[PDB]
Amino acid sequence: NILGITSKKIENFSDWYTQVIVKSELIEYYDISGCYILRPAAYYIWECVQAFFNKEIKKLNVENSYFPLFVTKNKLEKEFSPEVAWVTKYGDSNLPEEIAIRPTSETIMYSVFPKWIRSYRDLPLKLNQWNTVVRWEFKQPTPFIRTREFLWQEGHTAHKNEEEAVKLVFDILDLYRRWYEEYLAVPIIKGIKSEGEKFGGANFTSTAEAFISENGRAIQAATSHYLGTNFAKMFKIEFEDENEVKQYVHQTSWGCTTRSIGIMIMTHGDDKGLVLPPNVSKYKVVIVPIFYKTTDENAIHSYCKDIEKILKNAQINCVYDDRASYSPGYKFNHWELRGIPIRIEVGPKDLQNNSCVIVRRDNNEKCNVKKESVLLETQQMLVDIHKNLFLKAKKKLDDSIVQVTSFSEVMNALNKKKMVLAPWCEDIATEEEIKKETQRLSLNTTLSGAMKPLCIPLDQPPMPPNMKCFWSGKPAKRWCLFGRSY
Ligand SMILES: O=C(NC1Cc2ccccc2C1)c1nccnc1NC(=O)N1CCC(CNC(=O)[C@@H]2CCCN2)CC1
Ligand code: PRO
């Protein structure tokens, strides 16, 4: 109890989250606000999704690279500026010229793209970086989700035409769907950003949106931009095509950050602490011995180590918690807090029956398994835990959307912690109006009450013939998701 989570996820979400990330050993706080330390359990998740995404972009011929952390005023100006951090001094001496820390690397990378792209033969150019970027905002930070320094990948491609670039945009977007679904067990909604919310310089921005139903907040999970020729004009990225005509390249860029870990935690975490999809947990299983005063401990030890060797030989990493000075109940909580997917309990009653208790972290179901069946039952249960984590999250996402036709229905849905799907004319002017009015009518958290346009979903319902925009009364164009957000 006292060593566990003492705030309930539904009652005090913010304090629940802080306790989970600290007591599971994911995060350590730091003496610069908005900067957090990723402890091994957190960084292990990053490495897992890194290995997945690398394998998939390699099939698209994207290659990894590394560009400088810094950019000059000259390059940075061809295109954020209040959130760009500036280096001005080395030791006690001022720099000959101030240099900026990257908030994103378009201007750094595209500064040299013209030397590499001269002819249609040089296309497509497909690059990725795994790096950190810095956005020195003064909004309230949130570990993983909203931080001043964060780890990401950013991919950048250049193509001979629009069709090829746009196809890659949406190929990447589906890889993000898979990153979230297959490794983090998180469902997302694909869509297009509104004009007020798209990336600066983008022709259009596609997005994967997630939703945290316990506090009613959407979170942008990943992004994939069609840049058209906009950046090519700014940086003079021209190539000579097959007809000897100078053309601009069509560009994309796309990223996904350690925010994804925060979305995973907020999605699956419960009042016992962290819950990890097996694919991003170092230990799939912890084995906890129960001695119940037998005094024949070497029989228990010998049995638990047998189970450990059966799992490790099958390449299932695990831990046998044989620490003498702690009770089994202490150990149960210890590893539940840290999110281990499966606990195997071995006491004397179990030894006599040649079995063991296998306990799932997601729903705490326990079942007795014969020793010889442990490997197979473990393998299947790890698969089933992931399936259950995803399906439960998918149902909560489905349930968080209310379809509306008028503004009068909107504030009711927001106060029930919902997103709204609404018919919208998509006029950029209306975005600030909707934000203002929904914030005004909010009367409760420390995050904003404003509702904003999340995305125009790729999967559109029919737009009835005379449906009007829920806000302006003009004819509606498409259905758009709106909600409060991180
Ligand atoms: O944004 C983060 N921190 C900043 C700095 C800071 C400090 C304190 C409080 C708040 C904030 C916000 C952040 N922090 C940690 C992990 N991830 C993060 N971001 C992330 O995941 N993003 C989604 C992928 C991209 C999204 N695309 C776009 O935004 C474009 C432009 C409009 C819509 N389309 C990049 C942004
Ligand atoms: O920051 C962004 O949203 C885009 C995609 C990654 C690189 N720049």
From Swiss-Prot:
Catalytic activity: tRNA(Pro) + L-proline + ATP = L-prolyl-tRNA(Pro) + AMP + diphosphate
Record's subcellular location: Cytoplasm
Top EC class for this record: ligase
GO MF: Ala-tRNA(Pro) deacylase activity; ATP binding; proline-tRNA ligase activity
Keyword Membrane appears in the UniProt entry: no
The EC number(s) this enzyme carries: 6.1.1.15
Known regulation of activity: Inhibited by the quinazolinone-based compound febrifugine from the Chinese plant Dichroa febrifuga which is used to treat malaria-associated fever. Also inhibited by febrifugine derivatives such as halofuginone.
GO CC entries: aminoacyl-tRNA synthetase multienzyme complex; cytoplasm
Positions contributing to L-proline binding: 135, 225
Single biological process term from Gene Ontology: tRNA aminoacylation for protein translation
Keywords linked to the UniProt accession: Aminoacyl-tRNA synthetase, ATP-binding, Cytoplasm, Ligase, Nucleotide-binding, Protein biosynthesis
Chain residues that bind ATP: 135-139, 146-150, 220-222, 257-259
Domain notes for this protein: Consists of four domains: the N-terminal editing domain, the N-terminal catalytic domain, the anticodon-binding domain and the C-terminal extension. The first domain (about residues 1-163) is required for editing of incorrectly charged tRNA. When it is deleted the enzyme shows pronounced misacylation of tRNA(Pro) with alanine.
Family recorded in the similarity comment: Belongs to the class-II aminoacyl-tRNA synthetase family. ProS type 3 subfamily.
Physiological role: Catalyzes the attachment of proline to tRNA(Pro) in a two-step reaction: proline is first activated by ATP to form Pro-AMP and then transferred to the acceptor end of tRNA(Pro). Functions in trans to edit the amino acid moiety from incorrectly charged Ala-tRNA(Pro). Has no activity on correctly charged Pro-tRNA(Pro) or Ala-tRNA(Ala).
Assembly mode: Homodimer.
UniProt-recorded name of the protein: Proline--tRNA ligase
Organism, scientific name: Plasmodium falciparum (isolate 3D7)
Record gene name: proRS
Coverage span on the entire protein: 250 to 746 of 746
